[PDB]
Subunit: 271 residues, 2 copies
């Protein structure tokens, strides 16, 4: 019973931290998106009135009619390339959602496909992460013999190892594919980085999709991006895990800072 | 970290890799078999609606028609409502909406119905994801632990009904797993589905579909609870928030045990291939 009370206090504090995090994020997102949302809000209503006046021969009541059936139409996209990419988007959980099942049977099969594919792909992702782990481990085990030379102690070397990991991982799984996407997809630099992060975190908004545009592309383009999806998902799993590990020590150092502070402040009211 | 096992591991993942490739290949061909027909059924009915007004309004440039379609669908990617009967739209980035969006990012569901457009929004979204996803992982771990300990006490109450009719061991563990999947499906999949059926006005299959697509954190965005311009019950979206929490915990557990079942199946297949190759044509 009492260990469950200690658990409830831990989970409660974590939950409230997450709520506060959402509150901060919400107010910040509003602060950035609303202003430029009006900048884009007037650009379409202007085109409305301006093309109703530039084409007076068109009925104003027939204007909204086309918008109805157009948004209804948003409600070939299904060649082997598209369905294969979609089968990738389900089992990786990267739910871009650009194309989705509309038939009832298609929805049922998508359910079964997800429930079986996500675990199997988890096994694959584990194997890839292990391969990368041993390949990077030999590199850090070779650079530790050239590091213990000019030095005295340790602990600093683990942090240098993590720094090397973050640097090479960022120049191989986020930077280089970003500049390639800049060129092939015609995206901007920040949009390329944005796409990399949103995809490799498995968030997958769908506002930026590599190989999804009406661009020529190469025979070895989308397959290479597939391979990048594999290794990048592994790398981002590791980096997210270790960011969580940093959060652990931060929580511990903050509760010990709180102890240090309350203990150094209680004796001041006494004096 | 060395030795010969790294070859033995490479054979494992490689075979799994080919399996997943095969798994994708099959998955690709079947989806096409269902979605492609109704895609052309609507693809030719709209090009008719195009041409029928392409001839009924020759006063239109028609080359500027699809041009207008360009800017309208591009603005729909930002979620526009260009109407005159309802010449007053609501903001997609108020506190209520932006809170839900910040929820969709840290859970990785990422519905994507509304997305950042400003430069700062994208940069902040990157930082926000990189810090939020692990923290929410801790929260999900705590909720999964709470559900696990409540289920442990629940099965600890029925253990007096086990030490009686045929005393076994593992066969009772499988019943435990059965109880887990059944009750979890009737509380985190079935009940919210019928609620979505009622409030959101979705169909039964669409409700189950939404539940599954969200609790797996896929999140296509074609179905969003509380995402329509409907009144709702003010105490609806918070309840769906709590459902998001407990459902993600439950689905993590269910996916993990599906993987374990796949493991046992894979071992039984590696033994079946041996039995067959050794028995060669009986
Ligand atoms: C950039 C983000 C920074 C976020 C990090 C700031 C810290 C906030 C997160 C703290 C969450 C608790 C973490 C672990 C808690 C205990 O399991 C831990 C076991 O190892 N025990 C203690 O620390 C020894 C003391 C035990 C503390 C119990 C948990 C805290 C409860 C304190 C308040 C009690 C009321 C709770 C209701 C809100
Ligand atoms: C139909 C459609 O969906 N695509 C299309 C086809 C192929 C890709 C693709 O493979 N992108 C690289 C890739 C691979 C796997 C994953 Cl999990 C993600 C990604 Cl980004 C993208 C889009 C089309 O060209 C039409 C629109
Ligand atoms: C603006 C917008 O984004 N929403 C909106 C507001 C709130 C919700 C919501 O909370 N749905 C339940 C929920 C909670 C958390 C998560 Cl991670 C997922 C879900 Cl489904 C949805 C949509 C609006 O009504 C306008 C369009
Ligand atoms: C041995 C690993 C090297 C890491 C780079 C290999 C490819 C990973 C992504 C780079 C290419 C992705 C963009 C697609 C270019 C055709
Ligand atoms: C080194 C392990 C290789 C995997 C052995 C074959 C596994 C194939 C059976 C499980 C794969 C998913 C099948 C789902 C329907 C039975
Ligand atoms: C829905 C996909 C079902 C696919 C079921 C069969 C695919 C995997 C079978 C591979 C069998 C390999 C035997 C391993 C021999 C060592
Ligand atoms: C372990 C289940 C929760 C125990 C405490 C219940 C009331 C606390 C929330 C108000
Ligand atoms: C997903 C379709 C893109 C074209 C081929 C990409 C790789 C095919 C085999 C992995
Ligand atoms: C009518 C809904 C049918 C859902 C079928 C689910 C099958 C799960 C197999 C793992
Ligand atoms: C990753 C989600 C599916 C978990 C089952 C796969 C087991 C190996 C991954 C840890
Ligand atoms: C981002 C602000 C979080 C503050 C942490 C409060 C918890 C204190 C632990 C004793
Ligand atoms: C406050 C929790 C729900 C967040 C969605 C915003 C709408 C609040 C009233 C339903
Ligand atoms: C406001 C645009 C200037 C460049 C982005 C600055 C904001 C970064 C997140 C606070
Ligand atoms: C080009 C700007 C890239 C955004 C900076 C990302 C920093 C991540 C810190 C967590
Ligand atoms: C994943 C569990 C799905 C529950 C089956 C739904 C059956 C509804 C019949 C009324
Ligand atoms: C819902 C479980 C599917 C596997 C993804 C888990 C998190 C992925 C990015 C952290
Ligand atoms: C340690 C390897 C266990 C067997 C490989 C994983 C099987 C994946 C599901 C078919
Ligand atoms: K998604
Ligand atoms: K999406
Ligand atoms: K979308
Ligand atoms: K996800
Ligand atoms: K997703």
């Amino acid at each position: 019973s009492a260990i469950n009370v200690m658990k409830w206090k831990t989970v409660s504090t974590i939950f409230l931290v997450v709520v506060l995090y959402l509150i901060i994020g919400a107010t910040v997102f509003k602060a950035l998106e609303q202003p430029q949302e009006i900048s884009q809000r007037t650009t379409i209503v202007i085109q409305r009135e301006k093309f109703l006046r530039a084409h007076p021969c068109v009925s104003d009541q027939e204007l909204d009619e086309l918008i109805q059936q157009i948004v209804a139409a948003i409600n070939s996209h299904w060649d082997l390339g598209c369905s294969f990419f979609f089968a990738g988007t389900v089992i990786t959980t990267i739910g871009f959602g650009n194309i989705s099942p509309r038939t009832e049977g298609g929805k049922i099969f998508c359910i079964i496909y997800a429930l079986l594919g996500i675990p199997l792909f988890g096994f694959l992702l584990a194997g890839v992460g292990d391969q990368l782990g041993t390949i990077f481990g030999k590199g850090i085990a070779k650079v530790e013999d050239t590091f213990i030379k000019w030095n005295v102690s340790q602990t600093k070397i683990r942090i240098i190892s993590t720094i090397i990991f973050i640097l090479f991982g960022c120049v191989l799984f986020v930077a280089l594919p970003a500049v390639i996407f800049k060129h092939i997809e015609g995206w901007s630099a920040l949009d390329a980085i944005y796409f990399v992060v949103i995809t490799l975190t498995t968030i997958g908004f769908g506002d930026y999709v590599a190989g999804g545009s009406d661009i020529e592309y190469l025979d070895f383009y989308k397959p290479v991006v597939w391979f990048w999806i594999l290794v990048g998902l592994a790398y981002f799993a590791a980096v997210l895990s270790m960011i969580g590990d940093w959060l652990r020590v931060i929580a511990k150092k903050t509760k010990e800072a709180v102890g240090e502070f309350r203990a150094h402040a209680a004796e001041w009211t006494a004096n």
